[PDB]
Amino acid sequence: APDEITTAWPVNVGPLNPHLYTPNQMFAQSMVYEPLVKYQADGSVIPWLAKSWTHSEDGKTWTFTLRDDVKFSNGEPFDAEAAAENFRAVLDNRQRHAWLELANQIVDVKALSKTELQITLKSAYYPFLQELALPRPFRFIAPSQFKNHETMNGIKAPIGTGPWILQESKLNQYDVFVRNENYWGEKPAIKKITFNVIPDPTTRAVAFETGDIDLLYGNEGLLPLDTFARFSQNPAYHTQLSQPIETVMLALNTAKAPTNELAVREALNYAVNKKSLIDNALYGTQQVADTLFAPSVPYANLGLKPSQYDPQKAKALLEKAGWTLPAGKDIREKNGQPLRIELSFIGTDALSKSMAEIIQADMRQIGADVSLIGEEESSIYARQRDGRFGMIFHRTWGAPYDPHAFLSSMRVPSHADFQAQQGLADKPLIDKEIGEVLATHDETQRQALYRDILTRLHDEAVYLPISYISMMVVSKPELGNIPYAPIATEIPFEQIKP
Ligand SMILES: COc1cccc(CN(CCN(CC(=O)O)Cc2ccccc2SC)CC(=O)O)c1O
Ligand SMILES: [Fe+3]
């Protein structure tokens, strides 16, 4: 067993290098490795591996007082030296962390003693503590497990301070975690967690029905949503649906014809019946999104005007811009050119395909010819990084990334958002203001800058917001209520109490 559970994940957890990305899975890195400060649902951080901290008047020098009772799972001590060596290991690979502005802000990290850790920054970077709280990269592996005094070229054993220890991994089969019996904090009620590798959502549903697994936990792609709805009525099962955690949208390429035209992007934003899309493809399980960030997101309650479903207005906008229908044709033309837009998505993702088909149908109704380009994952991500798309499915990152970290990353040219925004005359101003907002401690100016950035992105119709999506749970009733974590990408296994 009653203190052992079996769940599933589409892939293995990876080698659990705390400082690297794909194929490491963030929820699993968070099971084993811990931060200096821990993120809370109210947006603050609490003391964690660091007991307390102070900062200089200019806000550029921070000194953390560390706990002195923490051991890595292999018995070796956690101290300021171990922490400092981890920061070094991360920043020796600084280029790979460009998306995260703290990695560009840290100028020095040194252990002043066994318990005092000093971090110095380029500027007064306000999201400092929240980015220290992220699943990666600033969490701590035992320095003995460095390879050649680094982590960027690999690690030995994935030894953390966290409440879970990786027991064993079997590529394409399973991963097994066990409770850390020597954890500095509270002991998890669960003793053992087995992750079965099950890449297909239908197969995951079937695995639950047969009793092969005890728990499914994930976002809107966890299992088929019609099946989820059926499960929620099944008295043998338990299901949960969280409050929304992030946005799913479309990103429109402002630097590529015909989405380079504001009038076209505005029309597309009137063309989609989002409520119908959600009820049709998402089985009514998610919420309609009118803006890049939901009004509940910090700094994003701005009274931005929604573009409600209005095919008539969409047509009028296109007509006014010179996109008119030839005799006998349903696809508009201008200057000889047809109104043709390519929508790229992961071809094997049934949900994405379903939504893409609905979007194509809705846009054909207003005279736009959307071509569906379904491709493998690697090809879609390549398209995102180099801007080879007309429209592309995209999503925000949830707490604590939204909005500051998502906005920060809009400045990175190898990200979808930069590419989508590249055609805007105001793009340099936007990027300047993003840099400014991260470093201001004038709260009035900070809100003003967020308003200007988000309002320009909204008014320029860079995105086509679709849904605010939720976390979803399917479980054996004996496991009880399943909690959600403050960080959207983490799974609070240590909080489960049968
Ligand atoms: C569930 O995945 C995410 C949930 C919340 C935020 C992000 C954004 N990631 C941003 C950085 N990634 C790129 C991206 O998701 O666009 C990973 C990354 C960083 C540096 C170089 C490569 C890559 S992916 C090969 C954070 C992370 O992966 O730690 C997520 O990828
Ligand atoms: Fe990522």
Short mmCIF file of C-alpha atoms in Angstrom, two decimals, residues 32-34 49 67-83 85-86 114 140-147 156-162 165 180 182-184:
data_model
loop_
_atom_site.label_atom_id
_atom_site.label_comp_id
_atom_site.label_asym_id
_atom_site.label_seq_id
_atom_site.Cartn_x
_atom_site.Cartn_y
_atom_site.Cartn_z
CA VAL A 32 16.08 14.02 -6.61
CA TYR A 33 17.59 17.51 -6.60
CA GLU A 34 16.69 20.52 -4.46
CA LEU A 49 18.67 24.35 1.48
CA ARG A 67 21.49 24.57 6.57
CA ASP A 68 24.26 22.58 8.23
CA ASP A 69 22.39 19.30 8.64
CA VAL A 70 21.89 18.25 5.01
CA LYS A 71 23.54 15.23 3.45
CA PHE A 72 23.51 14.01 -0.14
CA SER A 73 21.92 10.56 -0.42
CA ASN A 74 25.40 8.98 -0.58
CA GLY A 75 26.36 10.39 2.83
CA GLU A 76 28.53 13.25 1.60
CA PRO A 77 27.82 16.67 3.12
CA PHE A 78 25.88 19.46 1.48
CA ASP A 79 27.73 22.70 2.25
CA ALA A 80 28.56 26.03 0.65
CA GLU A 81 31.54 24.49 -1.12
CA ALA A 82 29.35 21.83 -2.71
CA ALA A 83 26.84 24.51 -3.71
CA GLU A 85 30.95 23.95 -7.24
CA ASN A 86 27.50 23.26 -8.64
CA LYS A 114 30.90 26.00 5.14
CA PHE A 140 22.67 20.37 -6.47
CA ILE A 141 24.40 17.08 -7.22
CA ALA A 142 27.19 15.70 -5.01
CA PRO A 143 30.44 17.14 -6.47
CA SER A 144 32.03 13.68 -6.19
CA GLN A 145 29.71 12.69 -9.03
CA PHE A 146 31.08 15.31 -11.41
CA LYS A 147 32.94 13.88 -14.40
CA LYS A 156 28.37 9.62 -12.55
CA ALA A 157 25.58 8.65 -10.12
CA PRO A 158 22.64 11.08 -9.94
CA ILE A 159 23.17 11.88 -6.25
CA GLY A 160 20.95 14.62 -4.81
CA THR A 161 19.70 15.79 -1.40
CA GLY A 162 16.03 15.22 -2.26
CA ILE A 165 16.51 8.32 -4.97
CA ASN A 180 15.41 8.70 0.73
CA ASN A 182 18.18 9.79 5.18
CA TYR A 183 16.36 12.87 3.95
CA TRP A 184 16.85 16.09 5.96
#
